[PDB]
Amino acid sequence: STQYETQGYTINNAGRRLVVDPITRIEGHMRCEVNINDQNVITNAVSCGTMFRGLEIILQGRDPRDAWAFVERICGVCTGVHALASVYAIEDAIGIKVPDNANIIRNIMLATLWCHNHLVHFYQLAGMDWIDVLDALKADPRKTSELAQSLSSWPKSSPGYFFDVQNRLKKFVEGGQLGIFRNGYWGHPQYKLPPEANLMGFAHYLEALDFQREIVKIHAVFGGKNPHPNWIVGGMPCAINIDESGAVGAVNMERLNLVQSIITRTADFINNVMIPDALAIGQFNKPWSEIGTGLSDKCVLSYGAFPDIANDFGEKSLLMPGGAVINGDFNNVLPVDLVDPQQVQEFVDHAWYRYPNDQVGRHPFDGITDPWYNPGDVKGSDTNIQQLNEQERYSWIKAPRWRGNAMEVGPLARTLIAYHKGDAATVESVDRMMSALNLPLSGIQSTLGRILCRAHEAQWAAGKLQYFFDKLMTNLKNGNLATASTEKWEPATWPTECRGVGFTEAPRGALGHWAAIRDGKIDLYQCVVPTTWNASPRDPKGQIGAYEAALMNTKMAIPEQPLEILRTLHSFNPCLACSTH
Amino acid sequence: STQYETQGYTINNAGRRLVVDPITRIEGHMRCEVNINDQNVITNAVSCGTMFRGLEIILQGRDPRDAWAFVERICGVCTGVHALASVYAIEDAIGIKVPDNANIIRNIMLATLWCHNHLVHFYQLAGMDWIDVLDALKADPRKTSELAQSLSSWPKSSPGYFFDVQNRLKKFVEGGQLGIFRNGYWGHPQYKLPPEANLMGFAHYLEALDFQREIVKIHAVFGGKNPHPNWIVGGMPCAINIDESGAVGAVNMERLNLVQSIITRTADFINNVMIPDALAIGQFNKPWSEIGTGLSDKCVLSYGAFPDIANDFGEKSLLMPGGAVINGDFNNVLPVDLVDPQQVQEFVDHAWYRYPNDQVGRHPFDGITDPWYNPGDVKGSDTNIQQLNEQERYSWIKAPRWRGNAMEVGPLARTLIAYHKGDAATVESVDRMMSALNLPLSGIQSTLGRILCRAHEAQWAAGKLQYFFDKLMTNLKNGNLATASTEKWEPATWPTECRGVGFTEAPRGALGHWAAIRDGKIDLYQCVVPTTWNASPRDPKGQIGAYEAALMNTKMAIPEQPLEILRTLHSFNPCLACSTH
Amino acid sequence: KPRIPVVWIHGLECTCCTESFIRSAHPLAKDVILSLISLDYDDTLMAAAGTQAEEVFEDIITQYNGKYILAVEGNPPLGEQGMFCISSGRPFIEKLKRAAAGASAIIAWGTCASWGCVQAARPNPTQATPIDKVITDKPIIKVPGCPPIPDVMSAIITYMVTFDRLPDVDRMGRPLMFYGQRIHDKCYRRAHFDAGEFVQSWDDDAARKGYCLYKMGCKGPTTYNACSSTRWNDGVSFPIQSGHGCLGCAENGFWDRGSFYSR
Amino acid sequence: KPRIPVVWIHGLECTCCTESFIRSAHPLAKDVILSLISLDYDDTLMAAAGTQAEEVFEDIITQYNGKYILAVEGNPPLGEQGMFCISSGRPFIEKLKRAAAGASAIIAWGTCASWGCVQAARPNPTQATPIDKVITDKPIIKVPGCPPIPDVMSAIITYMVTFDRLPDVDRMGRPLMFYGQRIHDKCYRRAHFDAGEFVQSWDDDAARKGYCLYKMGCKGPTTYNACSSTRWNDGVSFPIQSGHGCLGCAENGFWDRGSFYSRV
């Protein structure tokens, strides 16, 4: 065994090894390994992406105008965000400026995706780590009604409703076909909700599974379908016609009325179901405000998103702020430049790829994707792995760093950056949330805090949907209908050689696409995605990424049952297809 | 002034005359006049239909295959029922038998209409006679939640929900723009509900206004649109294809899944919102079990409906029973024959029509529709009716009689016929309902009873939707897909001269269409519709119809505010376009 | 912040246009009434009856003279000195003229108010006459169909409220947005029309594959409306999708253009 | 009464077919899971992970051997000894073969499981291969699209439960009910195609009137699916209705048929 120090942690691989493969209730394929000491405390953590497809290779030689459609299929969960980054990148390279309505509609597409993905994760992916579903069968329906009514104005709270939900669950398990609930962790000592809170949460799980399908009707209006809507280089294909012949063939007043109806319903569900449930999880699980901190009190990163001034990606335009913090110094939010070769770099010394020199990092305009499956001296063999060897190559995920630092990205990262830059709405929301819990601001830097920030952001994005809708309607009232710029659509109008960067904040964090065009074709296309950051393997200095750091020093009640590991990994909402592409 | 005796009543036109024109919260145009005595009790009542269009005249010379589309436009409220009666009448004339799936689909169309029309009437038309909307502004939201939860398992019952409804109402009225609530009867002493019941009722009014739009999606799948779906002579046009190429062009499994989803939601709303509200109106308004009896303890009529054996209109096939009671003799339910010239006849001695002898009644195969506006001495002029002259002609509605007897039709009439024929489900339902209210069976024969029977029928129809859907799916599983018979579609296959009758139970009661065909064209088309029966004027013997009888003997608290007249008239759900056609 | 006053009156009609309005999916009719307009008179929905309803009518058209919108459903009959349709003891046409005189603009809902519809089909026993032949000094927006599509009615209302203007219209007074193209120019069965692939009798093999309904009498080639694009009842269907040809119900005189089953 | 056992596995994929399934409007996915089938294994939704998830997989395929339906999303890579997709430390293809051996029938959801989809587009770095080239002794129903339509997925499931049989298929294994006709044979813009009325550049006057997208690269003339009839997301829209030509996403090899903006 070996021991070394990094980032205030002691990384020690002596002692008992535990393996979790597959990780479930995520997107895609992940393996996790840890070592635990005699006191059942994690002393080593290993994050492994167990899939790869090679989109960066497939994109070579394609027409730049088609790229969005290929890279949208990086992920069907965060569907649309890669298309957005792609049209941004190609427009940056060629020198295309889109009309204001196209920019507004793109911002509506992104805010819709934030609302949808944050809601589904809370209930369908993370929820069963916190809610003991079988314990809901022991609840009193009247006491469940009283609890729900004390927390929210949401209409659906009668004792008869909670009795009906409880009886549906009782019938489901009566024949011994427990389905998704079979062989779960029910009764583990870390489940702390009372039976009435478990029944309330289970009812809301079912309400959210139904309601999420409605949110994406906004994507169907502007983008044709969800999953995987359509886009164009130059704007959007959804031409507008309000008051002329043939409005039946375009985005007209009846289509915009459908969008408005969905926005109001989405805000209502998030504010009156998701927000009170997140606060209730906090009230009953306060010790988790001190577990899973990881890199969140050290190094955090946001690129920023939602440009309000069309074609302006600067600080005065982005509604979601960008910036970086390192060394735990939240008094110094630093600006990010995605062209600077000394800022974003990716390492592969601990990943399954070839570089000419694996002891240095490469900026994405110098990126290389040359796959090399080489797990080395594993326990087991190369096609039958019992333990990865984390001293050598152990993942399909590359290792991104910012100025050589390992960073956390996502809702908690963005919330810290906006708070410390002085964004008034963020400061007010965070202060009120932490005051309700009687917890210090430092309590947000934790597994519990990641969940709270995600719920905050769903509320923020639902508000921004209305703001963007009203901006669109103001333009239409003023006779400004344009949705596409086509003066640089044809390849003969492009520079013979050019390069560009497209960036945004996906639901899970900072996203960038780097593209080089030569002679009308894609010459290079490199992606660095939020789960690539968070799920990163180690670098040549031995520095650990966000998942490995958040798992360090965690106590386990029952080593064979990985509930504490699942709670902390699920709090980042892992997307493994995104991470590897 | 004069006085005479008929049907146990003393009809006396001495005393103060009151006029209500327009009657609102009905379909179409009606005027009512009454006389009251020195104790403010009604001693004379006059029902007047104030519109006419002449569909029976317009139908002459049309192709029989087109007739359904014209007569559907008798009414957009009971939309579809006239099309059903028309295809039945033309099929009976020509000798056409339809396939089983067509009959099942037609029964689904009719049951959908019963659910929709009974729900909208309860809330949007009659509800404001029973609920004092402005008094809801004084309610305690927590006490409202407690009342709702004591009556039903319906989920939408939180204190915050009732507060949100109350605040919406407060903001609506605060600027003085009271809309549909302006100059109402709020505060009248016959409003008996406490404030919390008025707020619960108003919340449900709004929920029903939203939900009713979903029910008619069943008509859109099978019939293309609602209002005014499409039909054919020979079956239905909605061809079925489940498992062959081109199912995208037909009624397929996805379309049937949509229908099933609507059926479940419809039953849930009726059973858990409408049924408990109807029973609560009964609990707080028991004196109305003794007001508005009219002809309901004397003479009642049903033709029967919902043939379960395709093309068989006999007693063993019809799921909704037919029969007649006269002279208060409920121990002898009599059979009805729509071809017998001594049974159904219409009189015009008190209506605006010409017959060669106005002292005799004409069966519909001998019917005449020759309009003659001749009001005599009204106070005023021919274009200024100050007081109708009920000694002479006073309405656009003809006077139907059965064997010379004045009859009541509709939900209460049907319930009494089925109960006294010994239908076991009806006997058990009615007995349990009256027991719960601690009222005798005779209490159903009243204004309150009409409302209770309508709600019971909505529940019955919602159950029958599932029964019919399951019968359709059984045929599809057995490979029986046929929806149309076309052997006699071409006019060269028809008899040179033939005649037929189409009959059913519309939501408001017994409906018949009588058609004669000659040389490929309609020679005669006569309709007798449920509101024609109930809103009838007098006959040569001076006998009064159902509305006039139900108003007789009624006490008014405040003569200038006709709340008691509106309660009794609305309890029949008047449809004046239907009555006059 | 006050809402725009609206008076809705009813002549000879079947009430289908009112029923269509309450089917609206987005915005809900509930939200139109509570938040977008002030529906100050409507015999189908209002609490007041008789003398109390007459007082509301008088008060609104006097207080808001020149500033309310008049919605009309149905039409006036000229026969029998107008007494085929009687309102407070007098011809309906007198109430129509009084309401029109104070209105800033008129919405003619449906084929009845726009053209005549079924009561004006041969031999027109009551001499039923469309609104624009009686009221000749006011803006009239025709929204035809029997009835018009629910979400078309609510989209026209929201356009007027949001944009503070009447929709642009064709030479017949119909909104260009929804009536500028024919049913047959946006019909999903047009591939079959172009290929000569037709239903010949009900429930034949062609009908079970969704072939074109032209030989069964479809009047889509001469009818302007939004049914084949916007569709009916929250986008669920339209007449042709469920297997029956278009009747032509948005066009003037459609009842008297021959049998619905003649080409 | 007991519900039919279903095992749902995931190879190389983006997860769009799973997301499509949960969008179903009628029946709701909630009601499919609670009342229509027994969803006995699925990495996206299940409580158990790691050794507990492996025990569920083993228990279900053993107890219900010969009686479960296998749903497959994604595909196996043949490159690097299969280690481009690793499950419980071994190649995914070993899990696919074990699950297939016990199944009564297999549903290949999406273009990935049916044909290959984006990871199989040139130069196919991982040697991604569709299910029917690995499993050759079991009935396979192909349900292609990227992803397939939500209410098509749920209609196929309800047909199989209600009628107790697999849907009838074309020569490629696709259900006739939803894949028997082309997009272009049921497209509401066909009047414009027939008249030579085309969009020529984005947001031109033709685009604002809903003219045909053929000259913008629409692949509807060669694509079999239900998008122009059944439509997407409870009937709200489809690609062409919102102004973009069909990409051809239900057809084998659609990524490598030239630019999406070059004519059919």
Ligand code: SF4
């Ligand atoms: S069904 Fe009617 S509207 Fe459609 S293509 Fe055929 S004729 Fe034209």
Ligand code: SF4
């Ligand atoms: S838009 Fe595409 S599918 Fe539709 S008619 Fe034109 S080419 Fe055919």
Ligand code: FCO
């Ligand atoms: N959100 C999201 Fe997907 C990831 N990680 C992207 O980008």
Ligand code: FCO
């Ligand atoms: N119901 C109804 Fe209409 C009436 N009266 C008919 O028939």
Ligand code: SF3
């Ligand atoms: Fe909509 S009232 Fe119905 S008949 Fe044709 S529009 Fe008239």
Ligand code: SF3
């Ligand atoms: Fe639906 S996993 Fe998404 S990429 Fe094309 S089908 Fe595959």
Ligand code: F3S
């Ligand atoms: S009959 Fe009318 S409803 Fe539309 S499809 Fe034809 S215009």
Ligand code: F3S
């Ligand atoms: S791109 Fe795919 S979703 Fe349908 S319209 Fe074309 S088959």
Ligand SMILES: [Cl-]
């Ligand atoms: Cl009126």
Ligand SMILES: [Cl-]
């Ligand atoms: Cl007309």
Ligand SMILES: [Cl-]
């Ligand atoms: Cl799997």
Ligand SMILES: [Cl-]
């Ligand atoms: Cl492919």
Ligand SMILES: [Mg+2]
């Ligand atoms: Mg990359």
Ligand SMILES: [Mg+2]
């Ligand atoms: Mg008659």
Ligand code: NI
């Ligand atoms: Ni993702």
Ligand code: NI
């Ligand atoms: Ni009616």
